Enzyme design. Structure first.
Site, PDB file in Angstrom:
ATOM      1  N   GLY A  35       0.810  -1.224   0.000  1.00  8.92           N
ATOM      2  CA  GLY A  35       0.000   0.000   0.000  1.00  8.92           C
ATOM      3  C   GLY A  35       0.839   1.268   0.000  1.00  8.92           C
ATOM      4  N   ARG A  36       0.232   2.375  -0.423  1.00 10.46           N
ATOM      5  CA  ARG A  36       0.922   3.667  -0.511  1.00 10.46           C
ATOM      6  C   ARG A  36       0.050   4.804  -0.012  1.00 10.46           C
ATOM      7  NH1 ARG A  36       5.366   3.625  -3.955  1.00 10.46           N
ATOM      8  NH2 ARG A  36       5.638   1.603  -5.017  1.00 10.46           N
ATOM      9  N   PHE A  39       2.437   9.952   2.929  1.00 10.63           N
ATOM     10  CA  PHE A  39       3.454   9.944   3.993  1.00 10.63           C
ATOM     11  C   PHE A  39       4.332   8.701   3.999  1.00 10.63           C
ATOM     12  CE2 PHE A  39       0.003  12.399   6.456  1.00 10.63           C
ATOM     13  CZ  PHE A  39       0.393  13.605   5.897  1.00 10.63           C
ATOM     14  N   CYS A  41       4.998   4.199   2.461  1.00  8.16           N
ATOM     15  CA  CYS A  41       4.554   2.906   1.969  1.00  8.16           C
ATOM     16  C   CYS A  41       4.120   2.009   3.117  1.00  8.16           C
ATOM     17  CB  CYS A  41       5.674   2.223   1.170  1.00  8.16           C
ATOM     18  SG  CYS A  41       6.017   3.008  -0.423  1.00  8.16           S
ATOM     19  N   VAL A  42       3.382   0.962   2.784  1.00 13.18           N
ATOM     20  CA  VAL A  42       3.020  -0.036   3.776  1.00 13.18           C
ATOM     21  C   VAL A  42       3.419  -1.426   3.274  1.00 13.18           C
ATOM     22  CG1 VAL A  42       0.806   1.208   3.490  1.00 13.18           C
ATOM     23  CG2 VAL A  42       0.798  -1.239   4.160  1.00 13.18           C
ATOM     24  N   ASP A 148     -12.237  13.158   7.455  1.00 13.47           N
ATOM     25  CA  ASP A 148     -12.026  12.629   6.103  1.00 13.47           C
ATOM     26  C   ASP A 148     -12.719  11.285   5.883  1.00 13.47           C
ATOM     27  OD1 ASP A 148     -11.115  12.490   3.441  1.00 13.47           O
ATOM     28  OD2 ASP A 148      -9.046  12.029   4.010  1.00 13.47           O
ATOM     29  N   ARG A 152     -13.045   5.368   0.413  1.00 10.67           N
ATOM     30  CA  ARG A 152     -11.599   5.096   0.264  1.00 10.67           C
ATOM     31  C   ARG A 152     -10.872   4.980   1.608  1.00 10.67           C
ATOM     32  NH1 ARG A 152     -12.402  10.473  -1.188  1.00 10.67           N
ATOM     33  NH2 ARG A 152     -11.631  11.852   0.463  1.00 10.67           N
ATOM     34  N   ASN A 153     -11.489   5.529   2.658  1.00  9.49           N
ATOM     35  CA  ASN A 153     -10.901   5.667   4.001  1.00  9.49           C
ATOM     36  C   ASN A 153     -11.476   4.703   5.055  1.00  9.49           C
ATOM     37  OD1 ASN A 153      -9.014   7.590   3.256  1.00  9.49           O
ATOM     38  ND2 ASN A 153     -10.450   9.287   3.509  1.00  9.49           N
ATOM     39  N   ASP A 166      -7.997   5.325   8.361  1.00 12.59           N
ATOM     40  CA  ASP A 166      -7.471   6.640   8.026  1.00 12.59           C
ATOM     41  C   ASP A 166      -7.662   7.672   9.140  1.00 12.59           C
ATOM     42  OD1 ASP A 166      -6.374   8.619   6.176  1.00 12.59           O
ATOM     43  OD2 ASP A 166      -8.438   9.405   6.063  1.00 12.59           O
TER      44      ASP A 166
HETATM   45  C1  46G Z   1      -3.160  -3.885   0.737  1.00 11.32           C
HETATM   46  O1  46G Z   1      -3.077  -4.578   1.999  1.00 11.32           O
HETATM   47  C2  46G Z   1      -3.289  -3.807   3.107  1.00 11.32           C
HETATM   48  C3  46G Z   1      -3.805  -4.451   4.223  1.00 11.32           C
HETATM   49  N1  46G Z   1      -4.040  -3.810   5.352  1.00 11.32           N
HETATM   50  C4  46G Z   1      -3.787  -2.497   5.462  1.00 11.32           C
HETATM   51  C5  46G Z   1      -4.067  -1.866   6.664  1.00 11.32           C
HETATM   52  C6  46G Z   1      -3.813  -0.505   6.806  1.00 11.32           C
HETATM   53  C7  46G Z   1      -3.286   0.229   5.737  1.00 11.32           C
HETATM   54  C8  46G Z   1      -3.023   1.736   5.928  1.00 11.32           C
HETATM   55  C9  46G Z   1      -2.190   1.984   7.209  1.00 11.32           C
HETATM   56  F1  46G Z   1      -2.453   2.219   4.835  1.00 11.32           F
HETATM   57  C10 46G Z   1      -4.370   2.418   6.077  1.00 11.32           C
HETATM   58  N2  46G Z   1      -4.968   2.806   7.195  1.00 11.32           N
HETATM   59  N3  46G Z   1      -6.075   3.326   6.912  1.00 11.32           N
HETATM   60  C11 46G Z   1      -6.282   3.320   5.598  1.00 11.32           C
HETATM   61  C12 46G Z   1      -7.324   3.749   4.783  1.00 11.32           C
HETATM   62  F2  46G Z   1      -8.401   4.326   5.342  1.00 11.32           F
HETATM   63  C13 46G Z   1      -7.239   3.598   3.404  1.00 11.32           C
HETATM   64  C14 46G Z   1      -6.131   2.991   2.818  1.00 11.32           C
HETATM   65  C15 46G Z   1      -6.014   2.897   1.441  1.00 11.32           C
HETATM   66  C16 46G Z   1      -6.839   3.299   0.464  1.00 11.32           C
HETATM   67  C17 46G Z   1      -6.203   3.064  -0.689  1.00 11.32           C
HETATM   68  C18 46G Z   1      -6.764   3.320  -2.076  1.00 11.32           C
HETATM   69  N4  46G Z   1      -4.997   2.559  -0.487  1.00 11.32           N
HETATM   70  O2  46G Z   1      -4.847   2.453   0.893  1.00 11.32           O
HETATM   71  C19 46G Z   1      -5.068   2.565   3.625  1.00 11.32           C
HETATM   72  N5  46G Z   1      -5.178   2.725   5.008  1.00 11.32           N
HETATM   73  C20 46G Z   1      -3.016  -0.401   4.525  1.00 11.32           C
HETATM   74  C21 46G Z   1      -3.270  -1.772   4.381  1.00 11.32           C
HETATM   75  C22 46G Z   1      -3.006  -2.434   3.182  1.00 11.32           C
END
Ligand code: 46G
Length: 289
Positions: A35-36, A39, A41-42, A148, A152-153, A166
């Site tokens: 994920g991106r 701020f 990457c994840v 927000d 998407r969030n 988010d």
């Molecule tokens: C793709 O696999 C995963 C799995 N779990 C995640 C948990 C949190 C997150 C994290 C920390 F980025 C996150 N926390 N809250 C949100 C959120 F509300 C939305 C998103 C998001 C939306 C989009 C489009 N890409 O990432 C990512 N988020 C990403 C993950 C990605």
């Protein structure tokens, strides 16, 4: 990054042991970005608890370390099945701290409802909305304003449980398209989810979260269509003030559209509470098979 316990509000010192993850307890798989955000990457991580580990190294400076910890401590005490939890924060010798979140198998709600792989029913989509409302009722009861809320969030776990996400240390712009720069203040704002009064003052309240929730319901019932596609950024205020609202999606039940219109009441104080939204949506949901 070093932790100075004296620098904290003395009431919070005991909570640090429960938020800080020892580097030996966490393995992070930096080999693949899952994920991106703006701020950082994840990545996949293992705590065997499967988690999502977010880097904040795209930020030049993270700010006051004592505040960052305080944000983490306040966030970690939130616990609700429709709110994303914070597992902890992990310090690394070189670079900013890592934020450790539960792994959300099915990603963000908008992409999930847009995915051709899955086929949620109208009942399922309403249920996603109900789950969001329950998470927001919880957050509102903690006097927390999201600022927000949008499809998407919110994210979905392996059991398709919807969690408001988010916020706190997970706050970011995860889809830059939907954020426009304010000319006076410079703030990047999700204008098409914002309440009329927030577009004017840039003040956010729980009642402005209720407006955003109305938009989120519309997203659910259109399976993730972009709101107001033929309106440009800050011209949304002029559009709304012409006496306009998002149209009723084809498969949106009439009472659910009525709920949406209530969420967009011109008087913030006249919008329903999240408790009222849970009640009303639970009833509508119950009518479907
Ligand atoms: C793709 O696999 C995963 C799995 N779990 C995640 C948990 C949190 C997150 C994290 C920390 F980025 C996150 N926390 N809250 C949100 C959120 F509300 C939305 C998103 C998001 C939306 C989009 C489009 N890409 O990432 C990512 N988020 C990403 C993950 C990605």
């Amino acid at each position: 990054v070093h932790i100075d316990l004296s620098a904290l509000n003395p009431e919070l010192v005991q909570a640090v042991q429960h938020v800080v993850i020892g580097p030996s307890s966490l393995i992070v798989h930096f080999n693949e970005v899952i994920g991106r955000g703006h701020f950082g990457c994840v990545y996949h991580g293992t705590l065997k608890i499967h988690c999502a580990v977010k880097s904040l190294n795209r930020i030049t400076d993270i700010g006051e370390v004592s505040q960052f910890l305080t944000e983490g401590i306040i966030m970690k005490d939130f616990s609700h099945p429709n709110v994303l939890s914070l597992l902890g924060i992990c310090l690394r010798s070189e670079g900013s701290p890592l934020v450790v979140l539960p792994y959300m198998k099915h990603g963000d709600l908008r992409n999930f409802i847009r995915n051709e792989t899955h086929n949620p029913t109208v009942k399922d989509l309403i249920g996603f909305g109900l789950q969001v409302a329950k998470g927001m009722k919880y957050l509102a009861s903690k006097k927390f304003v999201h600022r927000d809320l949008a499809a998407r969030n919110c994210m979905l776990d392996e059991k398709f449980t919807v969690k408001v996400a988010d916020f706190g240390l997970a706050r970011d712009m995860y889809d830059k398209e939907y954020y426009s720069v304010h000319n006076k203040t410079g703030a990047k704002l999700p204008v098409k989810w914002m309440a009329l009064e927030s577009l004017q003052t840039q003040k956010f309240t729980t009642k402005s979260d209720v407006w955003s929730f109305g938009v989120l319901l519309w997203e659910l019932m259109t399976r993730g269509a972009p709101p107001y596609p033929d309106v440009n950024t800050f011209d949304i205020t002029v559009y709304l003030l012409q006496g306009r609202r998002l149209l009723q999606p084809e498969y949106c039940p009439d009472p659910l559209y009525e709920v949406m219109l209530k969420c967009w009441h011109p008087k913030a104080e006249m919008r329903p509470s999240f408790s009222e939204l849970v009640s009303r949506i639970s009833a509508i949901f119950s009518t479907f098979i």
